[PDB]
Amino acid sequence: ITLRPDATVDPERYPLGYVPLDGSESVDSVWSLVKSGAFVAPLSKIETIHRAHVGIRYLTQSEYPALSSIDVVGLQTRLKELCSRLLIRRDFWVLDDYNDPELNSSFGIQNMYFDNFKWSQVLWRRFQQYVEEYFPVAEHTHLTYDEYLQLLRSFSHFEQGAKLLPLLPKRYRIHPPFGVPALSRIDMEPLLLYSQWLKNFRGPLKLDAALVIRSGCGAAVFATKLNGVPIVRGVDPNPRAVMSCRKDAQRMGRRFDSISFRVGEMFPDKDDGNGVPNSRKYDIIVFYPDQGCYNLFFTNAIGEYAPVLTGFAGTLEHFFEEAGDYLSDSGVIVLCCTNVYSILKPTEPHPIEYEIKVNRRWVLLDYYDMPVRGKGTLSHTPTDHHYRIPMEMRKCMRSELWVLHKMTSIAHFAHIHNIPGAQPPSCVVSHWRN
Amino acid sequence: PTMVKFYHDCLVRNNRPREASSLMRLAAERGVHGYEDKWEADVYKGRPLDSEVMNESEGQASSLAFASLMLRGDQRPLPENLQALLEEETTRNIEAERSVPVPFSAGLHATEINSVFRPRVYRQLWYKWQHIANRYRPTAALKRRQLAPRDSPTGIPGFYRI
Amino acid sequence: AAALPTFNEYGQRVVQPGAHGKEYYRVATNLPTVRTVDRLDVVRQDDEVLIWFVGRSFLRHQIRNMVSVLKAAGHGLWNDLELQQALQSGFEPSRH
Amino acid sequence: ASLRYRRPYWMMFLKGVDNWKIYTVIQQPDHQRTEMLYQAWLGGLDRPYTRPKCMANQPLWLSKKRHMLRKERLDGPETPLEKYVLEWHKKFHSFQGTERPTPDDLHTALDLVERPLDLSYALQLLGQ
Amino acid sequence: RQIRPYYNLPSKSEHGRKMTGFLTPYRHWMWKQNELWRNV
Amino acid sequence: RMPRKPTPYVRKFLEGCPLPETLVDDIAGANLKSMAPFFTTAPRYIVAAESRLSKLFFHHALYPAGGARRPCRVLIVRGGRSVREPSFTINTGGGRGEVGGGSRGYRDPARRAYFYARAGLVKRASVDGLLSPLCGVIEAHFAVGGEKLCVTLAGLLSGGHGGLMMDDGNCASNVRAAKRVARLLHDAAHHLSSFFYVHTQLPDSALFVSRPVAVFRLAGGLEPTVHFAVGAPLSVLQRGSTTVLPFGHIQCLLRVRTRGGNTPWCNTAGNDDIVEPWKLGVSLDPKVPFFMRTLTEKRPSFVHMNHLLVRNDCETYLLPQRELLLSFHVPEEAEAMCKEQNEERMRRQAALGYGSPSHVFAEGPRTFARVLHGMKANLAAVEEASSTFRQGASGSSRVYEVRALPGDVVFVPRGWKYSVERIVGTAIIDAVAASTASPREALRAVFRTAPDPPLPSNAEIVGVEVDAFVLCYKPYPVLSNAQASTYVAANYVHSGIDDFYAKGGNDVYHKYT
RNA sequence: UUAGGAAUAGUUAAUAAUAAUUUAUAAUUUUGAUUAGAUUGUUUUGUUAAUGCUAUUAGAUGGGUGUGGAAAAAUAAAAAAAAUAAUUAAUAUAUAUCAAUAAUAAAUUAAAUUAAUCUAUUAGUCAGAAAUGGAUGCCAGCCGUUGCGGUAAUUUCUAUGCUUUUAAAUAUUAUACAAUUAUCAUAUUA
Ligand SMILES: [Mg+2]
């Protein structure tokens, strides 16, 4: 970001638009500067802005504690405002503790990911060219330190791999380039419940052609090939995530061959009537949506001639409408949520139960839930700050799993609803008739 | 900055704190790198030079013999016969403490202990103009088994040998 | 960045010929794909939007691809990063 | 819970110092300059001096000199009683003194009382 | 391990431990009883 | 050694950056190694960790290593409130011994989180749960004619003043304590419903006697204490033959309502019918779309009384019971002392003519004078950023607004003025609509955590709320020139603190006689 | 122990010599030294008909403090540590539950560790036919930055079955048939 010093706080004492640090003042003195709207960039070392980054995020959570659902939305709004003021310069190689070619010592999170001899000799130059693609030295004179930390983690995903444990058996690694959200330990368990569900329900349900929506890093696509689904196809609106996922499928051996990745907004194209792509009907459609704190709260209706919902409820109603055009008969949809839509927004009604009871387009075939076992960030957008889930929110979250089928396909799944220990609705018992 | 590191340790070893405090005061004012944070107050501000006292002692006469004596301001001298007997007490007490050897020093100051010097060429480096007397870098800069794997030779024949 | 010198898994220094100077200081395209669009307006009329393209010359399916990019941007799918990366991706001489 | 193996052996049974972590790193040249500049800050020395390696407090010869060189808080005594208080402190308040006062010496301090300020000096000698 | 009961002599000191090892004569007597039962 | 699996490749040696221990020592206030010059008046925030803040570290927090003369800072400690149980001796058992003395601090926190899974009603905790019956037995003492309640309020003012600064000449304390309440009731007569804040001693209903010689205990069974509080608590003489008050150091910050003539609620508001001025170029999406701001209650309209709570005879420890906003007005002596100390250190240490550059952090050889000028300029920028300038009567001083939560400890020095406001909730302001108009029209989501205010010459006392507990301590000593010149913090890393606060200051000849 | 083999030294012995002002034709090394490289060792591993080949993770640590019997001392799920704390049993740890922080990394590889009824058990099998599953373009339109078309391009690699298993490397030569390409090398004489 290139600063405009005329709109800053003190353009007379600080004509550059920011307040340099020099590594002498306390953390709460920097935190008082950031809360008033002053930009902060280091003068000499990266350690001064790294110490100001960790302490301000810790001081902000003490002033705004996460006591309920409305306190996490305010804390995420406050932390996004303050961490944008903590800048670092674009030419970070002129700082002191970037690399030392003689002592092989450096400060930063690159020492967690790379070797000392490998960084200070050859990898400081490769990272210098890695930032130039996404943030050129011409257009940007300063970088947000959250973007500098994400560039160091994405350079690790470019250099070496990123294991998806315990989803992938210790040797299959993905390479998300930049701007592609990877999965943490909390983001893995809705896919860990799905992988155990797909291990047992493949063959009783005869699932062959799987369709994965909003793949991101491709973790939901690679988890289906491990359970035995032969034909998987992924749809991702990010074009750079599509090129990286199909390159990782070549790198991950010869058991990922029928995997396909296309660019689409939510679903495939379905535009040509002469080429007829409608013969490719999927029997299982998977959706693993992302749930951010800003997106879960501001769900409301917009549009006059095309009235549509926004946020997490609007993403679900896009999935709940156009899934019938791509599903075969006797086919199911699989939704992987994480119960934060009901925790961070408890006043609004349940969005998944609003489709089943009111719209009456889908029938609840099965439902599972499992409590959260680990800790970490949840649905982390890459160039923003990290926020780990507190303990009182972690103990009530649950990794959900929703299996729905068509309202027209009641007569095929009618004997599934007749078994003991199942919950048939009142509409599928009237269609069975002994 | 290498000259200030050596010259400070020489004045400390040779029992000169006025010359060492003035060296830290000079390097902080000139902007020498590594010494902009170390700045000492001049506790010898009112005291004259050490050579000027020895010149005055060879040639007010009550203050001439006690010009070398340093006072806090809230201190007063003794009578001239009593203070001169007290100055010989501190003379024989200082040499009594400095004549006792430290038992595990090999007759060396603490500056001399673990102060082996070879130039920068001894540890994987070559000529640079700004490194005048550059101490060779420690062995923790280059670890073995991170440059070459096990049972494979590394191109550092005389690195770890001091 | 990948063609710059790096130590491999065996520790020996390897260097690709891309970061040499002939391939390093290489211009992006060779074909005249640099075109001018003088005006590009998205006007919200009643019940519809109108995307006006005013330009002297256009490429094959350029307008129909820019309309799809603007439609995906209207749903909120791209950012400042992805549009610039797509513009820096350039021409792709491959159908699949 | 002993400091036998945490500090040097000459600091055995050592209490009442300002900070005993100072005297474990004196021999470093950045702290050795700080020790010699502190002796010049305390006065009483004509040459640069460092305290011994196995001593935390000041030596007995040096702390006796700075106690003798210290100017008294009462300067310019007007009354002969106030001259006797300065003789009381040179005799019964010297550094590491051994001799105790005498009740006849208290009678001498009580016989020189002229002004009411002299009674406060005399009764404080009665309390000692 | 030497037991420190609550009814021992308290050391009202902010520079160390809050309870000493000085017993009560009842504690001395019952410790002697336990000593004999271990002596057998 | 450790068993390591052999690999035919090279080994990775990580030097990965951990959480810095100096960072958590500076945040927790337990550093004891930071030499910081240029004493300022900006407040210090300290997050209280588990067993990391005691009297030893709080003494260095009051008097830093740079040679300070007076604790001229407001110290906010997040989550530093302690709760003490009454102690008693056991008559039964093997002998006589006293138990029961324990601190509930740092382990039982205020405002437990309410997360649950199923205009809009949310579940929260706004009041401190441990001291809630102790505030209840104080609030019920003022519950009800009106003149008896007025003389009850006038009889319970701490020291006769209650924190209020009012000019009183040739007047006793018992008439002044009535004149202050009469001035408040004459000032609050025009508004239909207003409020004022006072300092109040503990009433007789909150203290009950226990037979064993004479033991006075609190009604709730819990005592609000600060375990890192240094010095001695304030001794208040009982008037009614002057004896000591049993809990005179524990006072209350009462909010009193006037009459003249755990369920927050959220609502999302909409509107019917240049964004980032700090950024040079234009962006397709704003980097920060929404702002979050603290919502405070309304102050009624305003000669006008001062309405500032000043404790000139004691050091104040505020333990808030609700979310409060404290506006601290700095006295002239603290800013004058900081100015003369900073200018003295600048003219002593920096004798260079500085070259007169354009700004402080300009290109050039960074000498000692340039480092000192840059640190002083950054200190002035911190003072200008975190404060505002208000008007007086003629007067103008720094005002620091501090968000105080339940469970915190706000150390206020003597002579510091402050006004108290109640925080009502939290709003969200989008950055797109706020660029064209005021942020009142740019409100998107508003959470109201305080649904309080009801709507059913002189003024009538309606009700009394306890917003904070005021722990009054004896005034900490101000060092002289010779005491501050010889004050070394390294002599106080273990002991000498109770002698520092019992005796006046420190010894001038401490540890170099 | 080194595919291309040469010098080494706070040095050897004597000694009325702790703490060597002396004496000597001194000491190591072509029977392979010193230095440089690799480097904990170890009938514990694997294989075989094999006295063959191939692996290893017990450990130690002349300047941090002359304290202590001994430096091994800046961190280890027990080795219970001076009153029987507890000694019935199983988990013996998570739960020493919050907190800046990232799986980069470190290990590991099933076969009950209490009882309160009630589910356990890959596939409508694929002899080879299928796969919007990979790789992959070319062309002049009378011919200017108009960006129409052939054209919904054709070929090439494939999983799977089929732990009866198929492709890649190594073991088991403890022997290498001759004549040649090249180096470590005794001239056969009454
Ligand atoms: Mg001889």
XYZ file of C-alpha atoms in Angstrom, chain E residues 5-40:
36
model
C 0.705 -28.738 60.089
C -1.324 -25.549 60.255
C -0.866 -25.248 64.040
C 2.921 -24.896 63.917
C 4.695 -21.629 64.693
C 3.979 -19.138 61.876
C 6.846 -17.031 60.541
C 5.340 -13.605 59.822
C 7.947 -12.780 57.187
C 7.474 -11.413 53.677
C 11.033 -12.413 52.687
C 10.682 -16.187 52.983
C 8.451 -19.039 54.098
C 5.245 -18.398 56.019
C 5.480 -21.376 58.409
C 8.396 -22.652 60.485
C 9.206 -26.150 61.706
C 8.604 -25.336 65.381
C 6.015 -27.762 66.717
C 3.515 -27.963 69.592
C 4.210 -30.335 72.528
C 1.171 -32.379 71.451
C 2.812 -32.737 68.031
C 6.035 -33.772 69.800
C 4.146 -36.399 71.813
C 2.246 -37.888 68.856
C 5.454 -37.892 66.798
C 7.074 -39.872 69.624
C 4.160 -42.348 69.499
C 4.579 -42.800 65.733
C 8.346 -43.127 66.279
C 7.799 -46.049 68.671
C 5.366 -47.734 66.275
C 8.025 -47.500 63.557
C 10.737 -48.644 66.000
C 9.008 -52.017 66.451
